[PDB]
């Protein structure tokens, strides 16, 4: 079949080494390794077949090599095909499918990446203009579907377990604390919070390593809020321990936290697990030998299994996660590092015969990571929210007004006070808790 001349329609120039490379050692479709932006637009709207995975990967990751205004111009230019019997086939096997693919790209763009249009009103204007000029019959159903989407964007099965209570009674907000709430319910309510925080993070906050740059507060607000929650719970656990100066009471505190970890494990809240593991690895807590001495061996083993998830670059964490099925809450840190090193450890552009080609497979690699993040965001936990426990943890503020350094220095100095360095003898401290320290355990009530 015959096409127009690349002097009137730029997407007709033929493939070459200066145009498109394919991956050599890997659903019937070739995997594009690199190509000019023209060639990338061409295969994004290919006439021979549709390529849903290329369209998904592309729209998730294009902003590093092409601006949104430029992409819209390019797909409009791909749409407006000039002509060269022969025509009748051309219309049916080139213009028709190529134009349907353009409309498919617009549909997916408006549907899954509408933030491009929220952050540039003129981009949404050009899109509506373009869609308005589309006048065909094979088009009509696509033109109306895109317009419905645009208009919209401009605006359990079984029952969950009974909520568990320990010393604090429902509604007695003022008595909520680490030892008075039920350990099972602490873990559950923290899992609900952390699950929602995990589910709110969008790929727009991750592609381009944008959470590490000076506008991170603007571009990754949900990711940062999630991390700051995790950090807060770690620091809260450390503070509960070292501010409990009586040894027997501190053993009760450390022991209860380990029971919270066990339930975290039961629920596949790996963010929860790591909150606890990080707290036990911290300088103020790790050195408290007299406290771990009294921890019963069964809880030691629970904490040991949890900590070992993090050893050898998370080897066991990664296996354990691959083997569970939703709902879970993954630890996000690994994803951040892998996305960052992928973007920083691979060239933005490959050179072939002096010609510059966008390195797309590096973008594929990053979309694979954001894809794995989304697959764990689908399924929610079958657990009931407790409005008040939830607010208790939403408002935890262990640091108060102190700065990081001042506060972690204070935690460490508390550690040294309650168990001084080995020469000095171990002092005694008066109890601070009026209620009984015995734990209800982690098996539910019925």
């Amino acid at each position: 079949m015959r096409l127009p001349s690349a002097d009137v329609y730029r997407f007709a120039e033929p493939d070459s080494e200066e145009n498109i490379i394919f991956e050599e050692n890997m659903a019937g479709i070739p995997i594009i390794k690199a190509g000019t932006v023209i060639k990338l637009i061409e295969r994004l709207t290919y006439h021979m077949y549709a390529d849903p995975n290329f369209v998904r990967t592309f729209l998730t990751t294009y902003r590093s090599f092409c601006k949104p205004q430029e992409l819209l111009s390019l797909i409009i230019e791909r749409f407006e095909i000039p002509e060269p019997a022969e025509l009748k086939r051309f219309r049916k096997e080139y213009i028709q499918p190529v134009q349907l693919r353009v409309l498919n790209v617009c549909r997916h763009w408006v549907e899954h990446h509408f933030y491009d249009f929220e952050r540039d009103a003129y981009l949404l204007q050009r899109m509506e203009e373009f869609i308005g000029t589309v006048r065909g019959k094979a088009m009509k159903k696509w033109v109306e579907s895109i317009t419905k989407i645009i208009q919209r964007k401009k605006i359990f099965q079984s029952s969950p377990p009974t909520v568990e209570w320990h010393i604090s009674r429902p509604g007695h907000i003022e008595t909520f604390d680490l030892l008075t709430l039920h350990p099972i319910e602490i873990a559950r309510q923290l899992t609900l919070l952390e699950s929602d925080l995990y589910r709110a993070v969008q790929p727009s906050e991750l592609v381009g390593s944008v959470w590490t740059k000076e506008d991170k507060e603007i571009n990754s607000p949900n990711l940062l809020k999630m991390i700051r929650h995790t950090t807060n719970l770690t620091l809260w656990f450390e503070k509960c321990i070292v501010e409990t100066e009586n040894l027997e009471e501190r053993v009760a505190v450390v022991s209860r936290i380990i029971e919270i970890l066990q339930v975290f494990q039961e629920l596949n809240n790996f963010n929860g697990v790591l909150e606890v593991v990080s707290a036990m690895n911290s300088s103020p807590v790790y050195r408290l030998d007299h406290t771990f001495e009294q921890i019963p061996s069964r809880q030691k083993k629970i904490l040991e299994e949890a900590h070992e998830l993090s050893e050898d670059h998370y080897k066991k964490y990664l296996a354990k996660l691959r083997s569970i099925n939703p709902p879970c809450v993954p630890f996000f840190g690994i994803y951040l590092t892998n996305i960052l090193k992928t973007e920083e450890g691979n060239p933005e552009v490959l050179k072939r015969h002096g010609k510059e080609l966008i390195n797309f497979s590096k973008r594929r690699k990053v979309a694979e990571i954001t894809g794995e993040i989304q697959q764990y965001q689908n399924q929610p936990y079958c657990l009931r929210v407790e409005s008040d426990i939830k607010r208790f943890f939403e408002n935890l503020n262990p640091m108060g007004n102190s700065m990081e350094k001042e506060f972690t220095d204070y935690l460490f100095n508390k550690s040294l006070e309650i168990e001084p360095r080995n020469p000095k003898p171990l002092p005694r401290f008066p109890k601070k808790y009026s209620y009984p320290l015995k734990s209800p355990g982690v098996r539910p009530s019925n």
């Binding site: 408290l288 030998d289 406290t291 771990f292 001495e293 809880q299 030691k300 083993k301």
Partner: peptide
């Protein structure tokens, strides 16, 4: 030795 939550040999 080997972390405070480990079985001490």
């Amino acid at each position: 030795k080997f972390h405070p939550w480990s079985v001490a040999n």
